[model samples]
Every structure is written in C-alpha cells, then in structure tokens.
Target: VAQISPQYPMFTVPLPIPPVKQPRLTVTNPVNGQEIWYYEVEIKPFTHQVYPDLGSADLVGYDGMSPGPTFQVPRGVETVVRFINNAEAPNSVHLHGSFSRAAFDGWAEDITEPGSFKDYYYPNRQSARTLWYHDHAMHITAENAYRGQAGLYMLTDPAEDALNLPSGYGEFDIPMILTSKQYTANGNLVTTNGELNSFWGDVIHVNGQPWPFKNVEPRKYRFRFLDAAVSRSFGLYFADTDAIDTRLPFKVIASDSGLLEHPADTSLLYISMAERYEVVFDFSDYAGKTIELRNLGGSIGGIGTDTDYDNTDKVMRFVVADDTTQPDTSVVPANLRDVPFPSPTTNTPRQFRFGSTGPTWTINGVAFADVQNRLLANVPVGTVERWELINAGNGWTHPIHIHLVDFKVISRTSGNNARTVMPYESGLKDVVWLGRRETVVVEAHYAPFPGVYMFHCHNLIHEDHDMMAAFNATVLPDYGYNATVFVDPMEELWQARPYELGEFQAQSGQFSVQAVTERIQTMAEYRPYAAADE
Candidate 1:
C-alpha cells in the first residue's frame, strides 16, 4: 500500500471543457456503400497541468489529451478505429457499450505491445447511446485509465435527432467526464493496488480539471455525464452555494444503452464506474446565479450518507449567464424513445454471486482464471434470460457490468420486500450496482449475434483481480437435443469444492469459521442461493 497526500485549494478556477476532435479520415464502405468513420488515435506520454497551481506532470493520454477528444457519429454507420500504441506498455482499446464482435471487444489478454497497432471495427447497429472507449489491457487497466487513455463515444439516430434536444457541441450540449486522482507533492500520479480494496482520490476532476466551473447561457442544456473513475461512485446534485437545502432537479432522458421510453425527474443522480446518464437542466429559471454541482459521496453499494460541505464533495460549478438573445426553444418531450419493457414468460433465471475472501474476489466461488475454459451458462440465440446478481454479504459493494447486450432491470429485491428502481435505472442499462446484501434481477434477450460475452464487476480493481465470468450463446441445433444428456459445468465445478464453512476456511488462510459463516448468513438473508441449482 502507498500513502499519498491530497492537494490543497480545490475548485478555484472555471472548469475547462474538452473540445470535440474531428475524425482523421472517412471513407465509404465498399460492401454497403455507407459512410464509414475512421480515426487514427495514438496513445502517447505527455505532461498536463491538471491543476493550475501544481506544475505539469507526466501522464499517458490519447491524442495528447488526458480525457481524450469526443468521438460522435450518427447511427447505422460503420466505424473503424486504428489505435497506435506509442506508450511503453501494451494496450487494448475497448469501446464500452458497443455491440462489437468478440475480437474487437478488447479481451483482457489481447494486448498490442509498444510500437504496434490494432484496427477495430464497429457496426454501430444499436440506437443512440452514450458510449466510451478506454484501456482494457490485462492487469493494468486501473493505472492506464487513471493516467489518461480514455475518451467519449457518442452515437446518434434519427429518432433522437428529431426530439430537438439541446444542439451544438460544446455550447448547448456538453460531455461531463467525472474522475478522481491523487498526486504527490512533486505533482506525480499515485498508484494503488487494492490497499483500501479500491483507490479513492482526494481531488475530483471534471473534464481533466480539479473542481472546475462551467459557464452556461440562461437556457436549457443537455449534459452527457459519464462516470469514468476507476472505483468511486458519485451521488450528484445541484444546489445553491449558500444554501444546501435549495436543491435543483434535473430530467434524465437516457441511460447507458440509449434513450428511455419517457423522461424521469430526480434531484439526486447516482452514477457508478462505467455507467452513463444523459440529463437536462434548465438554467433559464436562475439567471446570473451560480449553481454548484455537488457530489454527495457514497459507496459503490449505493449505501451511505452525504458528506458535509467540503472540497472533496464539490464536483464542479455552473455559472449561468444572463443572456436574453440565446434561443431557448429546446423541448424535452415526455416520450423520448419507444423501447418496450422486458416481459418474458418462459425463460429460466440464472444466479451469480459476487463475494471475496482474503485478497481475492470470486464470481461464484471461482476466480476468473479458473473459469476461462468453462462456460458459466449456455443460452440459445433469441432467448431472453433473467439474471439474478446477488452481492454476497462480504461488506463490500460491486458495480456489475454485462457486455454484448443491454438489459432491462425487471425487479430488484433486498430480501424482505421489492424495492423500486431509480428513475435513471428504469431504462435500458448495461451496468447495475449491487449493493451489499442486495439482489438485483435483470432480463436480457440474446439476439442479432451469437458468441461468448463477458460479465463482471465494473470496478477496475475487482475486475483486474479476476472477479469475472463468461457465458456462451449460440444458435440452436437443428436436430432434437437430449436435455438430460448435457452435463452442467457449474454443477461439476461445485462438486469439486463442497465443504462447510469451517473446513473451507481451514483449507484457505487464517480466515475464521465464524467470519465465513456470518457472510454466508448475510447472503442467505438477502439473496438465498442453491449451489446445486446454480
């Protein structure tokens, strides 16, 4: 574990918004004749003045920017990205939330060494959504992404374009990338290795600046908020600087996958790592006034109280300009997208438990390395399956993310009664934060393609430490298949390690029998699981 000190004098300057970078090249697809977008991004080392007072420090970034340029394209278009690794280490680029093939999904082991390049192709078949690209190299994602090596990817469609939301790149519509970092006295980055289970930075950065402010006109604005931090979870709210009680509500129109069926209003927005939300805030009501976007700190499990007024909680500030000529014609429709809710009747439910022991995290009593050749489950194409993600009561929370398909949260229960899902989570989502002793059930339909997809806790620390699993989905066979003849891999895997809490801990380290029993009890009380069925 490394000890790092917090920087002083936060939020003294206006926030520096990142500019949208134009694509380096474009071409027409020879097969379909559709316009294809291409970018040649270079991952290199550079020095950036993250804080005004502190001198510039060496950092790794793409295209010379820490939070790299914003990449936007219309839907139904193909995209090709060529990543040139100029850094000293191997890198893998993952387009988060995109329906890319398994080859381009940035498998952790598929590394591009220094002085090499890899070309990724994206079909962009999904609806308009707020996606991002970041480093997913094995065992080093936390450090690489924390130093930089991340950017925004936006997809647009005719449906969303017709909604008449706030237009313009950096003026009316903005991308707010939230991240946290720790630095030494000499302005160098600090590295963490599961010391606190995860790293919590002292300095909060919005768009690569420490607690910066953004000036806006007295009109409605669309903000695409992305939680790009390695582990921190933020409960954001807008309030007056003098009075914290005076809260401002924002309308959430979209989640990670795409636009919701209707708009939902909320005063507080809870965002976890790799999760995104598109919100709209109307500044016309309070002209010439400054509104602070405060981050009420909480755990990744969505449990905790808001901290008192402090520098660490203040994320960014919003200064509304008294401009009368600025057109305020933007309208937030009650119905944004026509996506239907999940209403499956014949699918069986699958269970997954996220727990930890000593310094290792497991998905179902098995680490990631142990399940590489074994499929967690098998699903036929076009079949909808319900997945129940249980956060085994290990006193730690995890943000579970599923790759390849966006799913709808069917129901969430905390053992006793059914709990209502948040407004922002009512839409299609790719990531769900499993609070301690909580069980969340989501329904996802495997469609359009068939392959193996990965799912794991989105916390980079937990993910890098092997808290992940994979499931296979393939086309059904034409002939009649014997259901009982198929052997369940999970059953076989569980049979190899069946023991009581006492014997299990004794085989492991100094983990106590009582400690393991308490964890198992808490997990059963919250979300009971049957080992044989799983």
Candidate 2:
C-alpha cells in the first residue's frame, strides 16, 4: 500500500549542516593543569520541518535539533559532555571512536533517566578520525536513535592540519550524515511498520532532508560521509543522468578510524551503518553538471524491488557551478600517513560467530545481556591479536562495530578475484561489514587504555534486541585503574533519580578523567606487564 504523505520536489531543498558545538566552560584541571572543556547538552524534543512541502515532524535531539551538534575537538584535550536528560525517558551518549575508560564509555546500562544527567568524558588522544556521539541507552536504543539523537565528533591532529585537505567546515570541508527515513502525511518520522529485523525507510535523507541537493563550486571539496542509518548500507557512486563514468568518482582519503596511507580512487564506495569515510570529489571536470549520488546497495532487512516502500535509489544531487572561485591547489597526494599493522603475538586466530537463533541477534551464541558478570573475550594490553569475524548469519549483511580500537581488514574467505581484500579497505576500520557465510580476518592491537568495551551490530534494531557484548584489554595494575570497579556502580544508577551536580561530579571520580588521560598521554613510553609466565 502506498503511504499517504505530502510530496516534496527532489533536489529542491538544500542540504543543511549540523552546527558545531562550543563548550559552556573551558578550564584547566586543578590537579594536573591539563585543559578540560565542559559542556551541558540538553536532551529535549522539538518540531522540525525537513522541507517546505512536508509538515513539521516531531523529533528529539541533543540541545534541540534532529541530528545534534558537531563537536570539532582538538587532539589530546579532555572533553566532558554533560548530557542533561530533560525528555521523558533515559538516554546515554557514546563517543564512538574514543578510547575512554569503562565508566566514561557510555556503557549502555549506565543511562541517565528523565530529569537527570550523565557526564561523559572523552580524552581526545587517538589519531584524527571522524567519530559520532549517539544514544546507546540499553534496551530502547533502536527507537531512541530512530527518533533522532545523533551527531558528529571530529577529532583533529596537527598532522592532518599540515595536509591542507579542503580546509573549512561547511564550506570546503563538509560533513554528510546519511540515513533513510519515512514520513507520514501528518509530517511525522515513521520508524517501523511491524518490521522486526530492521526498518528501511522509503526515502534516503542527507543531513536530515529527503534527497536534497547542494550547490558546489568547481573545485576540490572534502566530504566526510557518515552512515548514521539504523540498518541501511549504501553503495555510493556518482551518476550523470543516472549513468556513471569514471571521469568523476570518489577519492577515498580516509577510513572510519583515520586517513588511509594514500588516497584510493574507486568508482564505488560501500558505507555500512556506523561506518565513516572521508572522500574528496573534484567537481572541476564536471562544471555546470548536475550529478546525483545514487544508492545501488541493499539493506539486509529491506523490501525488494517494485514494492510500495522501495525508494532505495536516488540519494542526493550536486549542481556544480560553472567555474571555481580560485585554483584548486589541494591534490590527493600520496603518503597520507604511515598505517601501522602489528603481527599478533599468537598465530591462532580468535573466531567470533555472528548469528541469530530466533528474533534475537547473537555473537558467538551469546546475547549481550547473557554475558552478564562475564566477558566474551579478554585481550592483553599492548599485545596484538587476530580476530576472524565469521558471519554465520541468515541472509543479512552484519556491519559489526568493535569499539575502543580500530583494526586492519586483511582478507575475506571468499571473493571472486585473487584481490581477496576489499579495495576501499586498505586502511584501518572500526566497523566490519560482514556479508553472510564469510569469515573476515582483522588484526588489532590492544593499547592506550584498559577498560571494558563493547562490540555490536551496527543495525540499531539488532543491537537493541541483545546483539552486543563486552570485553576488556588491560594492564590495570600498571595504570592503577581497575575498570571493573566503576562498571557496576554506574549501571546501578540507571534507575536512580536525577543526579545533582555534586553527586554527578563525585561519581565521575570512580574512573577519574584526569587519571585516565594521564595513563593514555603517551603510549610510546607505556608497556604492559607480563601476561602470566613471560
């Protein structure tokens, strides 16, 4: 059945960028004198008009917009975000790419209830990467994030600054949050229509608008693409009049974690949910052209072709102006960075099976809730290990996100050609886009911090239904931090009343932000103790 909704002209609405957030207070820590930025973000409901033709839809966001504010943070600074839950339910914020300790990690169970607040601390010590902060409040995360609660968190380092890759936010350097959503005739965002596996929307939205277009100058522009969809995966390629050519394609400069060693030119870019890629598209060749970013990929739980709700293609459009304001000086140069891949201490690969029994998703035959009081796997700090991600799934593409660290995707068990490794996957990645029955191998080193971290399916529906699990990589004694101590105390506060500032600030000491950042200050000088008999 065709859904009733007011139609908006395609490419009529202009793309909007999420506003970058400024800290409410920036103060140096009294103890260590390290700088700290404090933010008080209100979680409230608001009405948003996606387009003029469409009615205003009810949505929730951080500090009042559908997709929340972008935090362009400096590297090595400590950011303490106080998420004030002024809404009706509980919420928690997860800084996806940071190596935060267990307490500050936005553990799904450590949610702030209505009228309360929880402060999440992120030590921006990792490499420059495009990260996002989103709701991960245990059971209801699917519907919570579905209703609009996500934003970008870009960490910048001096190395990337020297590269001079299109340099300004919203001008040359742009952030695109892509997702698919459906709306009702009354102008409301529709989440699920009795579907259990996933919710594939009828319309693809770029930065909150449905198939909007943006005018780009005839120059080189850097685009940071983030797949903020609940389950939808995108195979994006540029097309002119719906036909594509290699004359204009995406030059993938960075992966989910950081920039690739060098820019990779690819005609097709595959972005799974929760994955991000920084690509530079040169519009100089296509002056006065109206190109479309089409979606040729399919979601695992999506409806097939010719269905009423199958508006999967037709992403967004770009109308390039006739000439550039100035000469395009920035080139996609080689040697972006030295990508490090360590050989694991052990040769035997650790295997994890992604499967589902009935309606619930599981990792290695265990749901997230089932792993209570125990961990799925424990890794030693500073030691590298090989993980074989076996997608023992049912007719689905499981984009798995392993938090705290990024890994190198070495090879897949099955591919048509001898180039078994993916073309766009030559760099580090956080989300493993696992296709069915294939075993993808990844090598990761556990370093920087010791804490209990999570890995889950990027599909919000699958994650909320118990597909997530936790593990720890530690040199706890050397760091004098036992991450397990704060896990329970914080989770116990999930149901408690609103927290006063005194209590919230006191509780934050359980896993002190300063203490954690102190240990994570320099990994080059840090070494882990012997793992038993060494």
Candidate 3:
C-alpha cells in the first residue's frame, strides 16, 4: 500500500466523527450563578492511520487526536480550556468564532512554546453555531493546522434544542471536516513544500480518513461541513452515478453563525476554507442508494482552474440504509430561527481592502507585522456598521473571517455571482468568501466585551504570511457596557489544576454590573500580543 492517493480505492475507510470533549469539572461561578465547564489538553504528535492503504501519518494535535476534540457547549455558559504545548514547535490556539477578550483571542505573536501552557476562558453567550479551534501561532499557522491541529466547538441554545432536528452524535448528527494533504514519494504526509500564494491537496480526507463513507438511516441526517483544508475552496454537491458526477438537492439549514430563517434548497453549496455550513439531506427518498458527495473544485489565485490530483474530484459517500431505524424521527421545520434584516446608513460602510504585496498578504496594505499599535479599527459597542470587503488584488480569492461577530451579507457588488445575497447565504456569517476582484458588503453590530479582537483571511497560508489585523471594541460614552465577570477559572483549582466563550452578544447589558463593585471583571486587559508597543 502506498500514499499515492489514486492508487488506493475511494470510500474504503469508515468516516470517523471526532469524539465529543467532556469537561473534567463543571463548577458554578463563585461570582455568579452561571456554570463553567473546564478541560485540559496536551499538544503532541501521534501516528494516524488515515486509510488502510496509505502509510501511517505522524501528525500533531490535542491529546494525540487530530481534529482535536469536539466541544458540545450550551449558550451563555462559561468554558475554560487549558492547552499545554509538548511538541517541539511553538503554538497558539484560537477559538475561531468566539468573542473572547484581547487577552484570550489567539494573537499570532502570543504563542506558547514547547513545554509551556496557556488557559483560555470563553463566554458561550451567542446563538447556536459551529466554531473551530486551531493553531494560530505566528509564521507557522498554515503548517501547524495542516499537519493536524484542529477541532470543532459548537454552542447550543434552548431554541435550537426545541427544533429537535436530526440530533445525535452517531448517524443522525455528524461532523464532516473536509481536509486534504499531499504525500511524499516515500509515503509521508506533508502540508506543502512551497505553494506560497495557495495550496490544494490531491488527497481528500473527511474527518481525518481518506475518502471515507458513512451508513445512514433513511431519515434526515444533519452534517456540519468544515473546510479544514489549509488553502482550498469547494463547491460541494451530491451524485448517485458510479463515477459520482450527477447533481442532487439538499437543504442548507445554517451558516457559519447560526440557523437561517428557513432552509434553502440547493444542489450546490459553495464553501471556502474555514467556512462551516450545516445541511440536512433526507435519505427517505434515496433509501438503498449510494450517494457520493463530491467536490467541484473552484479556481485558485483567481485566474487558473483548480488542479485535480488522483480522484480528488470525489469527497465522501453516504450509504442510505434500506430500512428506517426506530422510525427516522427528526424534522426540518418550515420555519427555522428568526433572522435579522441587516440595514445600515449610507455613512456606515467601512472599507476593508485585501491585497497581496510581493508574496505577503495584508488588509488595507497594513501587514500584521507592520501595525503600529496592533489596532486597526475601533468601533463603539452596539454600533451596527457595514464592511465593504474588497478583494483589491486581481489574482487571489480570500475567505475573510472577522472574529467575535456574526454578520449578514448585505450585498455582493462585484464578481460573477454579484448583486443580491444568495439563498444559502441568508443567515449570519463569521467568514465570507471573496473571489478575485469580488466585493462583498456585510453588516454587524459590534457589542459585548470592550477589548481587542482579530479579523483575517481564513486561508492558513495567506493568514500565516501576515494577512491579519486587530480591532478594539472601544469604550464609548453613555453605553451600558460592563466587564465580563470572572475569578480566574484555574483559581478554583489552586490545590491542583486548570481550564474558555462565543459569538457577539449585542445587548447593552450583556455583562453583569455587580462585578464593578467586587473587582470581578471582564476585559482582562491581557492582549496575547500586548507587547507590540516596541
């Protein structure tokens, strides 16, 4: 057996759903009545058997498991995650879609070196959505994550729970982490040699397995698609042919942020790197059929058609069970969550120009390393502003991610798919794909904690090469903004141990004012890179 992807068969491996992460301790906030979940992990390398045919992969990740661990948390609860770095390389972990403070938002410069650890606290105060955790250390983010350092973090709310959608960890609900890699001549896995501008893998892996498959009941199956590939974008569709190339329809129930107002039916779902999309495919009609989920590879660097390697054209397979197991009970309601209609004044659109300069990337010509105070834009809490993200360059596609806020796509002024918002793009978004020369306008209210945060390209390589910037949730006058309450999460374990929050909460009173008196505070004043004043 060799690492040559085409030489081996497709769907020979069983799709693995990364196991859910359980908190070691659940404690009531000594400050408030809220509950805080805590957990610990060590970063190290382990051998992964991707497929029976391919050679063993020496990869790095949390507790020896690549794709780390899935965190199932409730909205509004507190979470403290402790990460210990045992690998030879330095690392910084970013909870991709959370509204964490400047101190906790994984700044590229603030990294943990070998044998050191850092604890992160999060306020899971947002709606139901899927976020991810990955390496964000300066200079090596692309290599770190591509080498196998990532996982899923989900926030559930009571409203979403009541929907009773195809819900479970097994066959009903699933996590599909789409990743790709290249193999050396000697059967070793490596992210890239030097694919500077962009990198695409010929080897397709779903949930760490090479071309996997899952047997599903003839009901509704909900899948969360995370494009964990270092630098690839995809237009995913389903087909039933032996060659896997016929289009079939599915229901898109949510975006990177949360549930949409209603499910949008589509034959193709376009996702860029780091974009998470939730879709439900009803297998009742396709019972006994084998459906192949394949990728319609999009162009890279804007002009050239994507290069296909091996059978990289195919993704994974879904084998629909001929008979229903236990009645196939979940339903995709006609009406989902209530989505906000985002509108803004003509004076509110701020321009974010993304361009490349001699192999390096930047926003508005300011590379992450060139920033003066590491502060790009300062907006007062609760102000709804529109961002005009313009791909100023004509050669690259950027999937821009603005941490801490879920925004509505107001319009796409440029691009082939230019004009109005697409049906599946109606819900909230933490990351938006901008094709070469594409201009996408998105609007969101900046609220919650008053501290620094980051927004950058989701492409790990592009991001690693200085495509990130920081923004402060500036303290404005007359706003009832309050600090997040906390007594160090690890303080509770003074005798022995250890220890994480999510999306933008726009409420004026989002924080408890009682903390102003007790000195229990939010805005912990610790910017992972606060030492950048030099």
Candidate 4:
C-alpha cells in the first residue's frame, strides 16, 4: 500500500506493513465454488502520525499496520479468517455486520492472548453488504480497539451481483474507514489525562489517510462505509454536485445488521460509531466534477441530540475523471428483497432508555457495574419482542450494540413500520445504531444463551465512560434453578490495574505532566494512541 501525505512535500512512499508474522486465512462462497480473496494480517504497533495537532506512537495493528487490512469478497461466499494476536495483550475479532456462529463473535472473553492464535470462521452468510471487523475485548475494548486493530470486511451477494452493479475492486469501489482524533499543540494525538470523554476531535481520517483525495471516473461507484471511531456519529454528505443525497431517493443497500428488505432511497445516511453501510451512488451525472465527502456532524433526533462535538469538514475528496468508456452496468433497482414490517400488535412491546442522569451513561437508568445487581430487562426466551429505544440523554450519539443476538429494525417512529421498509433485513444482527431523538423499533428472537446479555453503545469511550447496561433474556427451567451468578459487587477491587507509573513518571515530571495526570483521572482517558513505546 502507498500513502501520500498532503501536508508534507508530495513525496510518495510505500506504506510499510508492521513487523509481525503474517496470518494465513481463507474465505470462499459456500454456495459457489469460488475462492474469495484472503488477506494475511499481522497485529503489531508502529508510529502513526494522525494530525498536525495530534500525537504519534507505536500502536497495535494487523500486518503491522494500524486499521489492519481491508478485505473484499464476492457476495454469498463463506469466509474463514485465521487470526493471530501477536501483541503482548489479548485480542478478539468481531465482524460488525455479518452473522456467524457465536464462537466467531470474538467476545473478548474468548481471545488469544499474546503468542497464541485463533480462527474466526464464518460463512459469508448474508447479502451483498458492507461490514467491519474490530477488537471486542471486555473492559479495555475501547483502548485496544481505537489504537488501530480495525478494518473493512465486504461481501457481494448473488442478489447484488445479479443487479449488475459496478464491480470495481480497488479503483471505483472504495472502502472508507472513517474516524477522528484530538491533537495537542505539538501535533501529538491527545488522550484525556483523566476524565470521561465527551466525543470530540480536531483531525478526521478516512482509510488511514488524513484529508485524502482520490481520482475517480465519472460513473457510478459503490462505497462501503464504516465508522471505526471510539464514540462519534457521522452524518455523511457529498459536497460535490455528483454526489447522491442520502435523505432523498438514494439507495441504501445494506445497514449495520444486514441487508435492508430492499433498496429504499433516503436523503441522509445516519452512521453511528462502529456501524457499517453499503451504499451506491451514480457519479455519471457529475462527470469531471470535484466533490467532497463530508460529515454533517451533529443533529437532533427523537431519541436524543448529538451536539457534543463538531469537527465536520471534508473527509475525502472525489475527483471525477472523464468517463470515455461505455455506459456502466450497475442499476439502482426499485426493490431488492423482502423485509416484512413486524406487526406491532403481534409482537410483545418492550422499551429501553439510554443516557446519563449522572456522570456515567446507562440503560434503563442503571450504570454498567461489574458486580452490582443491575436490572437487565426481563424477556421470555424464544418470544419475539418489539423493543423501543428512547434517547433520553443529552448531546451524545449512542451506537447501541446487543450481545449474542441479531435484530431487524422495524421503524424509526414508534408504533409504525410502514414507511422506509426494506427487503434484505430478514436475517440476524448483533449491533444496531440507536440515534438520539430517534425512536428505533426492532424485533429480536432470543436464540442464544438464556442468561444475562449486554446492550450498550458500541462507542468504546462511551462504554468506558459508563454508557452501558445489561439485560436478561430469561428462560426458566422446569424446576427452579439458580439462574443468576450472584456475587458481592465489591469483588471488582481485586482486578489488577494496568501499569500507569511505568508510562507516566509523576515525580520526575519528564513527560507532559498534564497529559499523564489527566490519564490518571479516569480509565476512559487512557486511550491507546499507540502501544507503550518499547
């Protein structure tokens, strides 16, 4: 891979893969006898210069590169990823949207610590869609994840393939891995010395490049978009005349959980952190046009409003070149699949509230205490229930993720799943984006473990800042059995703290005292910009 810095002298350089043994893996379409392209990755740390105002250091990654490696696969195929966690710490890989077996979910609890390895096997079982993979560790997920270990995972299913869509691999089709970071005066990436971080950033990045610009043909192109940020929502828009307005009649092929029931045109594309979307737009109308992909930043929805931070600017530039070739083959069909809206009368109604009444965020008004007897919602196992999410918190966008279960989004408005219905969202999903002021209703069938499961913001910072809550998908046995793992909450004190003094020398005052002191304040403040300088 080659990376060119726009700020520095326009000198081209090869993007060096980090120093680690490459992992061998394979992916194939089970339905067809096609060998899907497999990517070899190595998790390691390297110096990452994010911004003129941020810091740089050695961070953990795949192929010794931050943001790991990007993989593109033909739709309706099976993908088996053999991952090796070479770092000193334990790591797990979770595919953001693709549905697979529970073992492949990469629940941090199931990780291969340093020097060990594991295989994340899954059938490219869903529709042609955009997906992402990242670290899903338990407590330190935010830190281990934001430090770099993330990448794009795309699948082109038969339905999408039958549509004759643009099949540009590295050229017209691009993967946009969007994220943001803060910087200090000396151009160092900033991690709060100590405190729960409200989402904020000065530098925006796409595909590991800052303010990157690309050349494209004046034709239709498909973009697989993923938000890898710790805690932020991207209200994406195209500034170029050639861009498609998501709020209007543009087609959204896939969402976070899976493919929509069908292609439905909308004006705006709402992406909460850690979510992914596969969208296509025609640039044929704007050939030879210079357009910019931008983030609209914060907006108010029915659930809540996101006014916490604003760094909205051009993320990537698309320079539309002349299209001298024949007309493109891709078509935006009126219908894609069949996702029937769940009947409100037939499904059991359930409600969930998010945000903070205190310093930390919560679900149903309770923080995520490790041992505290937090009240998780009560639901009968195997019963299909309609869940209503009310964003009662202040300026923050929460990408609420559920463990072990996939759900279909029924509607944005309460008691209505009539409009904005799609056809591809008939399968399962593990994560859902719950925006503020926006009431999302979805039905989830409890099929996995019948014990306690968590549903909280996928935002690592928000999770660290206490924006998490758990729920119980209860299933009572024939005879009364101890269904709970009750223990004294005070046992949390036994956990070992990460080595802080080794990195921060308070007595010596050698490094930036402000940065170190701040990091000491809260666990959320100690985001890993890079792994400790070895």
lDDT, each prediction: 0.72, 0.74, 0.74, 0.56
lDDT of 1 by residue, 93-182 (tens): 889988665556776666778766666667677789999999988778888899898899889888788899987778788888998778
Per-residue accuracy of model 3 over 1-534 as CA lDDT, tens digit each: 123543556786788888889976555555555556767677888987654565777789987898888999988677877677778798888887787655566777767777566767677766788989999888798888988889999899889989989988765889989987876554568655466777777787888887888887778889999999888788788888554656888999999888989999998888888899999988787888998998775453232234566466688888987898598668999899888655565656888888876768888877788769346788876677888998865567789998777798888755544334678888888899887668888888785556667888988878878788887766645433233221121122111111101110221121123322122223223222121112
How accurate locally is residue 401 in candidate 3, as Cα lDDT from 0 to 100?
Answer: 93
- Displacement of the residue 153 alpha carbon in candidate 3, Å: 1.1
Q: Against the hidden reference, what TM-scores do the models get? A: 0.85, 0.87, 0.87, 0.72
After the best TM-score superposition of candidate 2, give how far the Cα of residue 190 lies from its true spot, in angstroms.
1.4
Q: Residue-wise lDDT of candidate 4 within 1-534, one digit each (tens)? A: 112222321112221222222223333333233443333344666777654344564477876676676666655444545465667678777776654434555644556666555545455654556677788766666777667788776666666667665666665566777776654554444553243655444456776655677776777777767788776566666766444333223566666655565664655566767666767776666677776776664342333244333334446667777773766767766665664333334755677777775677677777666436455677665566778776643455566787645677766642222223233233344556655444667777664334455567777877765666656666666412222221111123112223223332243332243432332223112211111112
Would you give me the overall lDDT of model 4?
A: 0.56
**Candidate whose TM-score is highest:** 2
lDDT of 1 at 249: 85
Clashing pairs in 1: 15-213
**Distance from true location, Cα of 377 in model 2, Å:** 0.7
Model 1: CA > 4 A from native:
1-4, 194-196, 298-310, 340-343, 371-374, 415-419, 476-534
Candidate 2 residue lDDT tens string, 388-505 = 8877543666788887778999778633221256667888998977754557888887765666788888888778876788877766455543334433426442232464545444
> Could you give the candidate ranking by TM-score, starting with the highest?
2, 3, 1, 4
Off by over 4 Å in 3: 1-6, 51-54, 298-305, 341-343, 415-420, 476-534
- Which of candidates 1 and 3 reaches a greater TM-score? 3
